Design a protein around this nucleic acid. Structure first.
Ligand SMILES: [Mg+2]
Ligand SMILES: [Mg+2]
Ligand SMILES: [Mg+2]
Ligand SMILES: [Mg+2]
Ligand SMILES: [Mg+2]
Ligand SMILES: [Mg+2]
Ligand SMILES: [Mg+2]
Lengths: 36, 50, 155, 140, 62, 217, 120, 137
RNA sequence: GGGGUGACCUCGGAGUACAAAAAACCCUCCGAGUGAUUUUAAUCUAGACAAACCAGUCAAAAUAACCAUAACAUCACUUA
């Protein structure tokens, strides 16, 4: 009707590696929209 | 006198949150300056007719 | 996180806010804002005393609402030439005014403040401590020609 | 009769919704008359002895201004503590007088004040004659 | 304490030369004013203070 | 314990002339004038003076001074009012025009039955009166003249108590706008006085502390 | 070849160094430290020290700043530190005292701009 | 769900209400000093030093060496104040400091340094280079 | 919420969906189908995000040219 375009998938913005995880060089630790 | 519609009408339609009726009241539970009052033993909606 | 004991450690918007009628109770007479005007023919002296009173208020912890300048009033001196029947230009006097707007003051502190200002008043300066009213606010604005003509044709 | 009043009130409201910008101050703006004399002003060639005496005078002036500020603030503190002692004595003596004195008088709104002069006024002095006129600009 | 905020100058860049003119108002007192046109003294006249009666009186006495 | 209450008025006449400059302030004024003349761009008077001095010099090979001389002669002819009005009398210590560089206050002489005190103007009031109105009525009836005084604030400026049964005196400050003191050749000894002569005259300890809340200037 | 502390990028100053020059200019004294990445002060030169206090008047001025820079350069040459970083504020880098301090430190042998890490 | 802080919160002491009468620092340098002073305190939450090796925090180091020289602090301060007054009483030193043309006796500075405070600087430099850690542990 | 008429069909932001992620309606509201400016913004390659697939995203080290101390083009809710 009047409300259009409200359909958009989530960008999966979150924390990938938690505290204690052994990571390697280049591993993305966390993605975010604003500086969290 | 209480107005039926506020001076600025809400143009955006809001969902009917029934949580504002569900549960105990947290505000206006004690006396301010009077000595008697009308206490509500349940939940509901008050409109201009009431 | 919400359930962690370190919740709200970055909470900062409550430390800064970035988004006056007279309060007379008889004992704590903290009236409204006050306008202190310093008027002088010497622009340098007017600015000097404006800076001085501003720094004095800042040291005395008096909340200064504003520190502005009013439009200059330029008067023309027309002297009567000798033998009468003439008016010739002598000079022109440019009168400046600097206004400091403070917020709060008590009776005792206001008395002490007026004491200090009138004791440190330089030569050739008019000091006027008044209340900030609607006419004092509208004085530093423009002509309402259309608006006054509209009121005239309405009345 | 009525449509004219409607248009009148409409124009009134439209003019009221406008801005209320202030008068530009002729002191903070430099006139165009000061653009032709900047090339004709010769330098000063300040000498070393004058520079040194000026620096010494500036240091002495800083010290003197500091001392003046200190003594003025000491006098202010003395006056303030005397005022607090007087108010506490009044509060101890009688509360009614303290309550009626802790307010502001209705005669303090139009506080006018004038500073001293270079010479005292001369008795039986007469300004010869002359009229005044205001040549200040207008703005809309 | 009258000479506290008196010892200053013009704190602007582009400005003309001003001179300490002695201005005397309609009282008999003088003040020092920074003013161009280095006339050693300026006099402030008056012709609008009193009403028509005193105006005619002064005109006849002059 | 009986209690007696009294108000008192401290009237200040402000200085009408400016104080002389300390030599340090004079050196600072000379330096400031020098640097102002230096940083100045140009004045129309000196501009036209140099213009004339250049055009005449180039025309003799091919005024501003008059105006300056006229102004200098007018300044020499005009005589200003005498800033010193006390060094010529040296006798009149009760005149309002005694001192012009400092602020003065008024002292009245009173010889009571049991006390002979050089006392500041005091009054007495019933519990139905205010202290400010008491000081106003004091300056109205005791001074015996029509003088206009400006009261600063409603709060008292000084408080002094003494017990014999006790008494309290509350000193309120006031500023003088204009004083028309009639009947000046009276026996009532009223004197206008500066801070040093106050410290010289005032003998008692309760009145020797008026300098605590009175500005020194 | 040591592991520099790459990282923050959002906060200031950058912690990617081995040694770091820090100049604190109080209202009375001037203190030039050379800190390691862990925060410990390796070599410091202060106007509060008697050696410079008794030899210098007005321990705050630009002369004193240049003096403490020279003394720190000599002490760094003695300690064996030749490279460090200096990250001043945009208003401290344009000042007169800090410019002369940097010039004196450079002339004393201590060169800023720590070398690039091999295989960073 | 909410948990209680395991100690004092950082900005819990200043009053939230009536912020205008509260003094602020208008200097980035002032804020940087305050932040670098607050960052060195042993907070109860997870900090950077705890993870990146503060070296067990505070340690009671055993002192195996000669005692410090017992000097009269009062007489020392008196003679130092006298020397400073004598240095400030001159006028050529003031002229040199004003003209920004003044040199320093670096040799005498180094001598006085190694006489009064050089030992402590050498001690901290050896602690940094790890001499004690491998000589006495 | 039978078809027809009406409306919509792709992309992004907020709520629904309160705290890792995802999450629908012909659910409630904003927007996009580009402008302006110059710093005209490369090659190669570890390791990762996201995802049915197609597509989308980051990016250390190494290389050529500029300070011999940056290069992620910036702004318009920048996300479209
Ligand atoms: Mg969505
Ligand atoms: Mg979806
Ligand atoms: Mg000591
Ligand atoms: Mg159906
Ligand atoms: Mg259709
Ligand atoms: Mg995955
Ligand atoms: Mg790279």
């Amino acid at each position: 009707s009047k409300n259009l375009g409200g359909k958009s998938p989530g960008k999966r913005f979150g924390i990938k590696k938690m505290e204690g995880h052994y990571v390697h060089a280049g591993n993305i630790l966390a993605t975010q929209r604003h500086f969290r | 006198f209480v107005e039926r519609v506020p001076l600025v009408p809400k143009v955006r339609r809001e969902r009917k949150n029934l949580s504002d009726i569900r549960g105990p009241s947290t505000e206006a539970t004690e006396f301010t300056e009077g000595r008697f009052a009308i206490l509500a033993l349940g939940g509901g909606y008050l409109h201009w007719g009431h | 996180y919400r359930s962690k004991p370190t919740h709200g450690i970055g909470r900062y918007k409550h430390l800064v806010k970035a988004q006056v009628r007279p309060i007379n109770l008889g004992t704590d007479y903290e009236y409204g804002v006050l306008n202190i005007h310093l008027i002088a023919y010497d622009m340098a002296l007017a600015e000097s005393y404006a800076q001085y009173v501003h720094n004095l208020c800042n040291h005395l912890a008096i909340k200064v609402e504003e520190s502005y300048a009013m439009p200059t009033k330029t008067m023309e001196v027309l002297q009567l030439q000798e033998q009468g029947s003439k008016m010739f230009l002598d000079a022109v006097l440019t009168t400046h005014e600097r206004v400091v707007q403070i917020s709060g003051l008590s009776a005792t502190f206001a008395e002490i403040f007026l004491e200090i200002i009138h004791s440190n008043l330089p030569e050739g300066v008019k000091l006027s401590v008044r209340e900030h009213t609607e006419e004092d606010f509208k004085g530093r604005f423009k002509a309402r020609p259309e608006l006054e003509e509209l009121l005239a044709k309405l009345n | 009769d009525q449509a004219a009043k409607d248009r009148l009130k409409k124009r009134i409201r439209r003019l009221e919704k406008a801005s209320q910008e202030l008068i530009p101050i002729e002191d903070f703006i430099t006139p165009v008359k000061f653009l032709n004399k900047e090339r004709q002003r010769p330098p000063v060639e300040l000498p070393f002895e004058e520079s040194e005496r000026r620096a010494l005078l500036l240091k002495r002036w800083s010290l003197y201004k500091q001392r003046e500020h200190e003594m003025e603030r000491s006098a202010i503190r003395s006056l303030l503590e005397a005022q607090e002692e007087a108010l506490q004595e009044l509060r101890l003596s009688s509360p009614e007088l303290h309550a009626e004195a802790t307010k502001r008088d209705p005669s303090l709104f139009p506080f006018e004040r004038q500073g001293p002069d270079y010479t005292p006024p001369i008795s039986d002095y007469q300004p010869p004659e002359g009229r005044y006129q205001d040549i200040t600009k207008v703005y809309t | 304490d009258c000479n506290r905020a008196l010892l200053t100058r013009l704190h602007r860049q582009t400005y003309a030369r001003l001179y300490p003119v002695l201005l005397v108002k309609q009282d008999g007192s003088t003040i020092h004013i920074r003013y161009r046109e280095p006339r050693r003294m300026l006099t402030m006249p008056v012709d609008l203070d009193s009403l028509s009666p005193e105006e005619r009186r002064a005109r006849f006495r002059k | 314990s009986p209690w007696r209450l009294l108000g008192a008025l401290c009237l200040q006449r402000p200085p009408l002339v400016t104080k002389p400059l300390t030599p340090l302030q004079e050196e600072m004024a000379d330096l400031l004038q020098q640097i102002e003349i230096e940083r100045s761009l140009y004045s129309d008077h000196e501009l036209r003076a140099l213009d004339e001095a250049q055009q005449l010099a180039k025309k003799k090979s091919d005024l501003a001074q008059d105006l300056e001389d006229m102004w200098e002669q007018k300044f020499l002819h005009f005589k200003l009012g005498a800033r010193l009005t006390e060094a010529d009398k040296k006798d009149d210590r009760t005149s309002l025009h005694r001192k012009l560089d400092r602020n003065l206050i008024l002292l009245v002489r009173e010889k009571l039955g049991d006390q002979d005190i050089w006392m500041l103007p005091q009054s007495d009031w019933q519990p139905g009166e205010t202290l400010r109105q008491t000081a106003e009525r004091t300056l109205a009836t005791l001074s015996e003249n029509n003088m206009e005084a400006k009261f600063l604030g409603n709060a008292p400026c000084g408080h002094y108590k003494f017990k014999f049964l006790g008494a309290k005196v509350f000193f309120f400050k006031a500023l003088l706008l204009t004083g028309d003191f009639s009947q000046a050749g009276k026996k009532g000894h009223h004197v206008w006085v500066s801070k040093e002569e106050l410290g010289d005259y005032l003998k008692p300890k309760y009145l020797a502390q008026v300098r605590r809340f009175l500005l020194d200037l | 070849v040591a592991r520099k502390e790459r990282g923050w990028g959002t906060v200031w100053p950058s912690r990617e160094f081995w040694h770091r020059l820090r100049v604190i200019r109080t209202q009375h004294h001037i203190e030039a430290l050379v800190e390691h990445r862990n925060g410990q002060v390796v070599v410091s030169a202060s106007t509060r020290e008697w050696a410079i206090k008794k030899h210098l008047y007005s321990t705050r001025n630009v002369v004193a700043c240049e003096s403490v820079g020279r003394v720190l350069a000599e002490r760094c040459l003695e300690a064996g530190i030749n490279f460090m970083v200096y990250h001043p504020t945009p208003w401290e880098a344009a000042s007169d005292s800090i410019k002369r301090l940097q010039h004196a430190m450079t002339e004393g042998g201590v060169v800023l701009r720590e070398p690039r890490r091999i295989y960073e | 769900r909410r948990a209680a802080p395991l100690g004092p919160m950082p900005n819990e002491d200043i009053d939230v209400s009536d912020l205008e009468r509260l003094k602020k620092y208008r200097s980035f340098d002032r804020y940087r000093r305050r932040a670098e002073q607050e960052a060195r305190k042993p907070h109860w939450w997870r900090t950077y030093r705890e993870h990146f090796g503060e070296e067990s925090g505070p340690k009671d180091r055993v002192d195996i060496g000669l005692p410090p020289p017992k000097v009269s602090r009062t007489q020392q301060l008196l003679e130092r104040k006298q020397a400073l007054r004598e240095l400030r009483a001159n006028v050529e030193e003031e002229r040199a400091a004003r003209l920004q043309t003044a040199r320093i006796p670096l040799e005498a500075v180094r001598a006085e340094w190694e006489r009064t405070c050089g030992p402590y600087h050498k001690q901290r430099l050896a602690e940094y280079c790890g001499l004690y850690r491998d000589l006495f542990h």
